[PDB]
């Protein structure tokens with residue numbers, strides 16, 4: 001155990017409900033399913049009964065628990081609040097190690113836990129800068145790296161199951177080349193989008209529009225979220241490409257499903273979306289190409305099962321671009337913290353006409369694209 005091979009397929013999930021890894025907290029170990037979240041920096045676990053919780057962290061049963069005598073209140077679409085402490089943590093299908101880490105024991109929450117998601121807490125994988133109550137609460141990955149010989153890198157293969165490879169890159173999880181984009185600032189995993197194309201047609205905006213006010217890679221968000229101006233242009237362009245069929249406005253707003261008779265989804269009418277990411281060299285970029293099989297999220301429901309029903313998984317944001325799970329799915333994503341960069345490669349996990357791609361280089365002879 002502890003080898004990248006034994007880490008393959010260590011993630012599970014429910015579509016739109018996040019991807020989770022099995023973890024243990026306390027001594028003796030208490031097994032919990034934990035949402036893998038690149039969009040936050042707290043390790044926070046249900047620590048009191050809840051209607052949506054199968055199990056929860058019982059601090060009174062752990063001799064290794066240490067109370068930090070400090071509250072944490074996290075309002076955000078909902079909220080969670082609790083108490084801080086430290087305890088022994090391990091990932092049974094991860095590295096062969098046990099570490100002492102900060103843990104926020106969630107004692108009260110609103111719209112945080114989801115009915116039937118199968119997870120009991122969240123593993124915030126981003127940086128200390130966005131940790132709550134402040135940057136002095138060391139995130140889990142920082143403790144893991146400080147306490148062991150685990151390399152300062154992790155990778156995610158999200159399969160729309162999947163794999164979280166801690167401390168390395170597993171070559172069996174992707175094909176082709178790994179293309180790197182710089183982490184602009186170590187808070188969220190912030191990146192820069194330099195160009196957006198839909199059906200190979202450039203949106204023709206100043207590239208700063210794509211990164212208003214930041215662009216991040218977030219496994220804890222389902223959708224591709226875009227700033228208002230970008231979102232409006234994307235929708236207009238997708239509507240034009242798919243004009244042979246007209247859908248309700250609620251569909252485009254992500255509040256209404258679109259259904260087709262089972263096996264008849266007209267994938268061909270929907271365009272490919274290309275996001276060009278800043279390269280590791282000046283004015284060089286690479287693109288990641290997403291198919292409608294990624295941006296039209298199937299909604300599993302026995303009641304609608306004579307059909308295949310989808311939610312449009314692209315939505316408006318007022319807090320910048322969010323490259324959520326629907327974007328990460330079908331790409332092997334390397335969070336290369338040691339080299340302050342994020343790598344993308346086509347994942348080993350489309351149709352007979354098109355395939356998702358990671359390709360480059362592209363030259364734009366260009367202004368700075370960030371805020």
Ligand SMILES: NC1=N[C@@](c2cccc(-c3cncnc3)c2)(c2ccnc(C(F)F)c2)c2cccc(F)c21
Pocket residue numbers: 016017018019035037038039040041042043044074076077112113122124218219220221222
């Ligand atoms: N990326 C994020 N992680 C948060 C979160 C909280 C609860 C459930 C999910 C989730 C639901 N469905 C599918 N995937 C994920 C995500 C989050 C917000 C605040 N505090 C934390 C904390 F635990 F670190 C996490 C969250 C809330 C809102 C916007 C976001 F970008 C995130």
Ligand code: NA
Pocket residue numbers: 145146147148149150
């Ligand atoms: Na180390």
